[PDB]
């Protein structure tokens, strides 16, 4: 009954592929022929942020679209004004291998994590002046890959031992463990209503989970190699996905399948960052050949490139009003584009 | 100008830029060494031969005013290709390979590990100081057994020095870049001369960086 359970799994995934084929009645670019394109979208560097020394690994905007967190491997997690390019905090980490960062929707807390297997939660609005390590969450065994805040009270993390988790901050205890991946999960993105979230791992399988129940709702497997970045559509019903086979695909939640693959023949190196615009018409993708491609979300054509980095872009994100897109590479500079 | 009182804010910005600069200097005096190797290669023996939370075990010590950070990363039970791109800017990969390479095959496994880690796209110019432990065990193992079990195409004597130089050339033949190099040593009876070897080898790497950084190379 071991191979009987195996062939039963084959039976159910073949009927899933049957349902995905039977619900597929068109292609996406069958419908994009009527909508007029966007043309050349050139964007200038408005600010550059020369603060770090080692390579930058993560960036995250603030919900008032002005402040900014960058976490970089000089052992420094520094938060930034962006209108007048000041630095408003510089927090020295404990372990100088940091592969993620996060910034609270209320703007009070900053999460951090890396190869220390420990997600730290820094308070910012302390009465005593400076910042203090308020919580120190330590439950995984692999490294950390992405952290996001639901509110000031619970944080969902993604790890290197194939698991994700949801922590309660004020207790410091692993409230929920999500598992079901077969490789290292390397991205994370909440819904805009924060009811449910996706995570993409090193086995090309972006899984959609829900934070309230505690186990996987949907699975999407379209890529050929390791998923490295995920962002949602702004309506919450779709999400893009970049991987290290130089392509980035777009999946729907209700249609349960791939919809469109942005991949140009000139490109050979993978993604490190995917985001959207405010309306969702654009898509922003980082790369390893040191430039960032703007894509159409519908017409699948390259609408402009944002080059200007001596090393590969490792973080990217637009604000919550669509005004600017920040990016940050391993050259320690962190650019802003309009 | 026309700034209202946020010139105090840019005073704060200049102050913490100054602090970032000073800590960057103070951490740039350090010398970082990533220690690699397979499981049971003897790397715990060389890290206890330095005489000074389970992801990365760090060992900071110092010797002749050289702060050696030594990152032992063998606790990271995952795929290496997702965190060795943060271990560039290290100045050496210490590499330990045991000399009992006959069982569950090991020196073939250590050989594949070595030429996967030295032909890696990030360590294309970082130089591998290479250690070779368990040498008296190798002496007894050639005193009774042939290690052509590991090397079927080997020609030569069954003595210690020739076999040592043969496996040393086998390891040194695995690199292909001109601007990096491999040092070699034997250990496991060495009472802290290997730390002196680490010191002189890393000074050789630092003067080579100072040569090809100042354009004289």
């Amino acid at each position: 009954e071991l191979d009987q359970l195996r062939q039963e799994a084959e039976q159910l995934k073949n009927q899933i592929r049957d349902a995905r084929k039977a619900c597929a009645d068109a292609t996406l670019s069958q419908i994009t022929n009527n909508i007029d394109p966007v043309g050349r979208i050139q964007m200038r560097t408005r600010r550059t942020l020369r603060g770090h020394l080692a390579k930058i690994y993560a960036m995250h905007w603030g919900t008032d679209s002005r402040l900014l967190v960058s976490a970089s491997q000089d052992g420094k997690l520094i938060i930034w004004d962006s209108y007048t390019t000041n630095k408003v905090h510089a927090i020295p980490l404990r372990s100088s291998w940091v592969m993620t960062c996060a910034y609270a929707p209320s703007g009070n807390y900053v999460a951090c994590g890396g190869l220390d297997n420990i997600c730290s939660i820094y308070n910012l609005k302390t009465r005593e002046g400076n910042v203090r390590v308020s919580r120190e969450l330590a439950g995984h065994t692999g490294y950390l890959s992405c952290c996001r805040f639901l509110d000031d009270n619970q944080i969902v993390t993604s790890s290197g031992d194939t698991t994700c988790a949801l922590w309660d901050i004020e207790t410091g205890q692993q409230t929920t463990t999500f598992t079901g991946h077969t490789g290292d999960v390397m991205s994370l993105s909440l819904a805009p209503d924060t009811r449910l979230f996706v995570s993409g791992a090193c086995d090309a399988s972006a899984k959609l989970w829900d934070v309230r129940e505690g186990m996987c709702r949907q699975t999407f497997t379209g890529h050929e190699s390791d998923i490295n970045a995920i962002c949602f559509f702004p309506n919450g019903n779709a999400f893009a996905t970049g991987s290290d086979d130089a392509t980035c695909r777009l999946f729907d939640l209700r249609a349960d399948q791939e919809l469109m693959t942005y991949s140009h023949d000139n490109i050979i190196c993978g993604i490190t960052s995917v985001s959207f615009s405010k309306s969702g018409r654009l898509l922003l993708a980082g790369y390893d050949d040191f430039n960032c491609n703007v894509w159409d979300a519908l017409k699948a054509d390259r609408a402009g490139v944002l080059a200007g980095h001596d090393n590969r872009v490792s973080c990217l994100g637009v604000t919550d009003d669509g005004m600017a897109v920040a990016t940050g590479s391993w050259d320690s500079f962190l650019k802003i584009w309009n | 100008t026309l700034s209202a009182e946020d010139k105090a804010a840019v005073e704060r910005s200049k102050m913490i830029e100054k602090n970032l600069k000073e800590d960057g200097i103070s951490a740039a005096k350090d010398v970082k060494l990533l220690l690699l190797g397979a499981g049971e290669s003897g790397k715990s023996t060389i890290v206890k031969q330095m005489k000074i939370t389970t992801g990365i075990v760090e060992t900071h010590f110092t010797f002749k005013n050289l702060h050696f950070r030594l990152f032992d990363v063998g606790g990271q039970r995952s795929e290496r290709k997702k965190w060795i791109h943060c271990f560039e800017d290290v100045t050496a990969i210490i590499f330990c390979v045991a000399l009992s390479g006959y069982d569950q095959n090991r020196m073939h496994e250590s050989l594949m590990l070595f030429d996967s880690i030295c032909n890696n796209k990030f360590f294309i110019d970082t130089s591998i100081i290479l250690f070779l432990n368990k040498k008296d065990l190798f002496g007894e193992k050639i005193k009774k057994s042939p290690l052509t079990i590991c090397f079927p195409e080997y020609t030569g004597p069954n003595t210690y020095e020739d076999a040592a130089a043969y496996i040393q050339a086998q390891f040194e033949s695995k690199n292909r870049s001109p601007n990096k190099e491999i040092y070699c040593h034997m250990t496991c009876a060495t009472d802290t001369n290997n730390i002196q070897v680490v010191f002189d080898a890393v000074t050789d790497i630092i003067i080579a960086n100072n040569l090809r950084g100042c354009g004289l190379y």
Partner: single-chain antibody
Amino acid sequence: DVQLVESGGGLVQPGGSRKLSCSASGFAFSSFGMHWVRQAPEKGLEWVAYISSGSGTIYYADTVKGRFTISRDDPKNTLFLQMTSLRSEDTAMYYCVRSIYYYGSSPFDFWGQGTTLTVSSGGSDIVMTQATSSVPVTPGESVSISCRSSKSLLHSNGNTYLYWFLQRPGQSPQLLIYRMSNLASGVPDRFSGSGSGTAFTLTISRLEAEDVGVYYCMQHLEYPLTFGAGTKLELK
């Protein structure tokens, strides 16, 4: 908690020199900006001195400048006001104030308890008037006070640098409203403030017996910072 304990006052002979020492304990003192603010035995506040973080810039009031000096010993976390040539217009209570500045900070958030310098008997600043003298209040009611500047305060960056303090009788001045609409941290929510350009107002809704005292507005657009006269409230 955080502590600002200052010392060095007394019945001191005029024309001489004194020293005031503010010892601060409970926070990272070396990253704060420090103000010295005095006030008369019958009149309102007035700014006296300011030293930034790391002793970068030092600003004085023009009625005091040259005569005094201000310094800090941040390994000792103390703040010194060395005052020379003391006239009879310096008989005042003096407060040590912490006013950290970055984007979104709350300056003047915490105040010392004041020491007294009672000595014997021996120009285009942005003047700011509180046109109200004092009104009678009662609990259960809501009441709004006003403060009119001379120059418009809404600087080009989009801010409006007006601060509302409350000093309780026999106490130290708390901070109520910073930058004309942002509420302070720890103050109850029943206060609010707004205004436009030059003329501003503070609406306290559902007044209680704790919220009686004197209320000062203060600009922060440029140095010097001058306070209003301060409207007093009194119960029944």
